[PDB]
Amino acid sequence: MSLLPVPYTEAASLSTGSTVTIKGRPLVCFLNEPYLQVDFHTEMKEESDIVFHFQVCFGRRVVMNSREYGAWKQQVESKNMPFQDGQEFELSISVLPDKYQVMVNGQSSYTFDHRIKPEAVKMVQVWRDISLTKFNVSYLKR
Amino acid sequence: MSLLPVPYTEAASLSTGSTVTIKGRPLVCFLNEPYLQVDFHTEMKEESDIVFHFQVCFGRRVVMNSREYGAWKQQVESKNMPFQDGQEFELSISVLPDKYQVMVNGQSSYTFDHRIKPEAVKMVQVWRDISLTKFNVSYLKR
Numbered sequence: 001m002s003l004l005p006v007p008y009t010e011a012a013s014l015s016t017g018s019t020v021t022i023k024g025r026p027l028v029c030f031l032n033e034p035y036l037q038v039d040f041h042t043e044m045k046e047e048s049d050i051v052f053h054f055q056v057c058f059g060r061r062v063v064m065n066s067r068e069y070g071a072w073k074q075q076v077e078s079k080n081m082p083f084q085d086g087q088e089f090e091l092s093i094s095v096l097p098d099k100y101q102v103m104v105n106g107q108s109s110y111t112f113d114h115r116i117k118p119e120a121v122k123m124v125q126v127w128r129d130i131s132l133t134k135f136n137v138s139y140l141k142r
Numbered sequence: 143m144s145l146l147p148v149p150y151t152e153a154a155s156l157s158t159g160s161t162v163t164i165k166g167r168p169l170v171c172f173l174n175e176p177y178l179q180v181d182f183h184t185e186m187k188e189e190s191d192i193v194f195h196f197q198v199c200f201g202r203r204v205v206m207n208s209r210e211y212g213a214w215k216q217q218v219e220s221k222n223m224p225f226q227d228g229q230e231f232e233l234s235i236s237v238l239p240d241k242y243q244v245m246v247n248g249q250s251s252y253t254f255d256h257r258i259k260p261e262a263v264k265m266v267q268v269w270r271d272i273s274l275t276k277f278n279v280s281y282l283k284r
């Protein structure tokens with residue numbers, strides 16, 4: 001169905017048991033190194049701090065980080081690449097007690113230990129070289 | 143006036159005296175490292191070879207390269223950064239006898255010696271984290 005705006009911004013609250021579900025596809029072939037970025041922000045402003053930064057270079061690598069009082073922290077780099085050239089993906093990001101868990105097409109693929117409480121999140125931004133059909137944050141839990 | 147599609151693709155021919163003019167703006171603040179990419183391709187297919195690859199990480203750096211029979215060649219990296227945070231830019235790329243010259247807001251900023259004859263170009267693609275208002279290739283010269 002319908003394409004969502006990219007960059008995509010949604011005001012958001014997160015806590016343990018929250019799930020962020022993203023369905024999209026890369027705009028171009030992996031040879032051209034399309035990117036995907038998901039940022040969990042502390043304010044609606046784009047320049048605000050990032051509790052969780054998740055950046056895919058499709059076909060190549062993923063980096064995760066935080067941006068705290070305007071400054072990037074220690075980068076985690078992964079060469080794990082479950083994403084398939086030319087294919088629609090479903091990303092789900094689960095807020096566990098101790099970490100974010102990133103599922104790609106139902107497969108556990110990345111985790112990132114909380115550096116800031118997930119309750120600090122006020123906004124989620126999904127951007128770079130993708131089309132987006134689905135975005136959901138669950139709000140079912142106390 | 144009106145926003146052009148991004149990624150932007152135009153069938154193109156280049157030779158000495160050709161100018162490619164691009165007016166656009168970054169989608170987000172430089173702190174979030176928006177990218178710009180301009181690729182001069184040998185075919186309309188996106189996977190085709192790239193005579194001239196020009197990739198800006200806004201606020202940070204520029205890399206130029208070629209992709210020849212599917213394989214990336216020697217990277218040129220520049221820390222020259224005339225692009226201004228939050229501002230509309232005008233990029234012009236001139237085909238000189240021996241190189242591409244990239245003007246940013248009327249200022250000479252990058253050059254890249256021809257590795258393949260500019261006559262090999264069949265397509266220009268402008269993409270990543272920009273909006274586009276103007277794209278022109280000049281066709282005035284023999």
Ligand SMILES: C[C@@H]1O[C@H](O)[C@@H](O)[C@H](O)[C@@H]1O
Pocket residue numbers: 055063064065072073074075175
């Ligand atoms: C400037 C920043 O450096 C950090 O270490 C990276 O994790 C971010 O992706 C960004 O490029």
Ligand SMILES: C[C@@H]1O[C@H](O)[C@@H](O)[C@H](O)[C@@H]1O
Pocket residue numbers: 033197205206207214215216217
């Ligand atoms: C895989 C490629 O490596 C080349 O050296 C770079 O110039 C391209 O931007 C791309 O990242």
